[PDB]
Every structure is written in structure tokens, then in C-alpha cells.
Design an enzyme around this catalytic site. Structure first.
Site, PDB file in Angstrom:
ATOM      1  CG  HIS A  22      -0.547   0.432   2.410  1.00  0.00           C
ATOM      2  ND1 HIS A  22      -0.148  -0.465   3.390  1.00  0.00           N
ATOM      3  CD2 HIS A  22      -0.434   1.646   2.981  1.00  0.00           C
ATOM      4  CE1 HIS A  22       0.213   0.187   4.476  1.00  0.00           C
ATOM      5  NE2 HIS A  22       0.063   1.488   4.251  1.00  0.00           N
ATOM      6  CG  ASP A  66       0.234  -4.113   2.573  1.00  0.00           C
ATOM      7  OD1 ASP A  66       0.560  -3.619   1.502  1.00  0.00           O
ATOM      8  OD2 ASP A  66      -0.035  -3.430   3.590  1.00  0.00           O
ATOM      9  CD  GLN A  90      -2.201   5.691  10.244  1.00  0.00           C
ATOM     10  OE1 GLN A  90      -2.374   5.797  11.458  1.00  0.00           O
ATOM     11  NE2 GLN A  90      -2.522   4.558   9.605  1.00  0.00           N
ATOM     12  N   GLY A  91       2.772   6.532   8.622  1.00  0.00           N
ATOM     13  CA  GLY A  91       4.117   6.822   8.200  1.00  0.00           C
ATOM     14  C   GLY A  91       5.099   5.712   8.553  1.00  0.00           C
ATOM     15  CG  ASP A  92       5.754   3.882  12.110  1.00  0.00           C
ATOM     16  OD1 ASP A  92       6.832   4.471  11.968  1.00  0.00           O
ATOM     17  OD2 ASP A  92       5.015   3.969  13.137  1.00  0.00           O
ATOM     18  CB  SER A  93       2.852   1.881   5.813  1.00  0.00           C
ATOM     19  OG  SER A  93       1.567   1.938   6.561  1.00  0.00           O
TER      20      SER A  93
END
Length: 224
Positions: A41, A84, A177-180
Site C-alpha cells: 500500500h 501487502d 501512520q508513516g511507519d507502513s
């Protein structure tokens, strides 16, 4: 990273930051000199030109080696939150040695064991909905959550064996959010997953969900 601490130099020699449009976006793991593993993603369907990778630094803005992308390969069966993973090819090679190293992947057919200690790292938000974004890398240690409990939390249809879960039952420690795309490792620093998804961040009873390296070795080994 929620509930974390500052990473030390050399803690994840393979970790990369991935910027988009010149600002923070995701994390990833350096597999070899021209290959990064990240979450599907983070990249699927986005303009590949917006991305830059940085390796060999605790900072996501400064230091180390940078590269643009030559190609993006999403897992062929990336569907929903499932499968993912994506393989990125770099137009600038990133040599190991000195301060950069390459990830050691979890064994094929392996699943992280419930209750075991895992460490996740990244430059994402420090609270759910948070506005600030760490410049230097953070990390946090959380137990693996049994897939049955994860299914209790999210519904059986939402969790597959291509995913695993990690977090604390009272909340407060998680990726956000932003660690993905960034790494989750076992207590030996073996790469067991990539940050994938969750309902919020650090909520009691909503574990972080991770793409399972052990379950997806066939994809990774073929294109790495």
C-alpha cells in the site's frame, strides 16, 4: 511509532526511509544493494517518480545514501489488506558495509509465535492522528498477538495467515501512520514482517497488523 524510544545508530542497518513528494511517507527494508521490501500500500498505483529511498541514517532527511526507483513490483495477489508486500528496485546501488547492512529474512513456513517479543521501527506518527513526524528513527517492542485474538478484534474475514498481529492488550505501543512498510523484527533482529495496517494506532484491543515474511518467502525470494 507510538510508545517507543529513540533508535541507536546501527540498530536496523537495513532500514530505509521512503519519502514521497519530498516529505515523509513510509519505511522499508534493504534486502540487497538494489532491492527494498516495503508494503504494497506504500506504492501500489502511485507515481513511482514521487519516491526516494534513504539508507544508512537514523534521520529520514539527512545523511546516508539516497536512490530513486527503477521499478516497482507489487505482490501479484495483493488484495485488500492482504499480501501487502512490494519489491522496489533502486537506480542507485546501496553497498553494504560500514553502517549499512541487508535484512535477514524469517524462515520460510514460519509464523511469529504468540507472546514472543518483536521490535518495530519507523518515522511515523507518535500518536494516532498525530501531526508531527519524527526526523530520527524510533522503535518499540511489542508482543506478538495470537491470530485467534486478532480475528476476535477484526473479524475472521479480515485476518489471513499472510498477516500476523502485534501489540499490547492495554494499548499504547504500536506502529502508526508513516511507519507502513518498515520492519518488524524478532528478538534476534530477524525480519519477520512489514508494517501493514490496523484500526487506528495503539488502541487497546486493535492490534497492529503486519505482512508476514515467513508466509511470503516465495514472492520475496523470486524477485529479490
Amino acid at each position: 511509532i507510538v510508545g517507543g524510544t529513540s533508535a541507536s545508530a546501527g540498530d536496523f542497518p537495513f532500514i530505509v526511509s521512503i519519502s514521497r513528494n519530498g516529505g515523509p511517507w513510509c519505511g522499508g527494508s534493504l534486502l540487497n544493494a538494489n532491492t527494498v521490501l516495503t508494503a504494497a500500500h506504500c506504492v501500489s498505483g502511485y507515481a513511482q517518480s514521487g519516491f526516494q529511498i534513504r539508507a544508512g541514517s537514523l534521520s529520514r532527511t539527512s545523511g546516508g545514501i539516497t536512490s530513486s526507483l527503477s521499478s516497482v513490483r507489487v505482490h501479484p495477489s495483493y488484495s485488500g489488506n492482504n499480501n501487502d508486500l512490494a519489491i522496489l528496485k533502486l537506480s542507485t546501488s546501496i553497498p553494504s558495509g560500514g553502517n549499512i547492512g541487508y535484512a535477514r529474512l524469517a524462515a520460510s513456513g514460519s509464523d511469529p509465535v504468540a507472546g514472543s517479543s518483536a521490535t518495530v521501527a519507523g518515522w511515523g506518527a507518535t500518536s494516532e492522528g498525530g501531526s508531527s513526524t519524527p526526523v530520527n528513527l524510533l522503535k518499540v517492542t511489542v508482543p506478538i498477538v495470537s491470530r485467534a485474538t486478532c480475528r476476535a478484534q477484526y473479524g475472521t474475514s479480515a485476518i489471513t495467515n499472510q498477516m500476523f498481529c502485534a501489540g499490547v492488550s492495554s494499548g499504547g505501543k504500536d506502529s502508526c501512520q508513516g511507519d507502513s512498510g518498515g520492519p518488524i523484527v524478532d528478538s534476534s533482529n530477524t525480519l519477520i514482517g512489514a508494517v501493514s495496517w490496523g484500526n487506528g494506532c495503539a488502541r487497546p484491543n486493535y492490534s497492529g497488523v503486519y505482512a508476514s515474511v515467513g508466509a511470503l518467502r516465495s514472492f520475496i525470494d523470486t524477485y529479490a
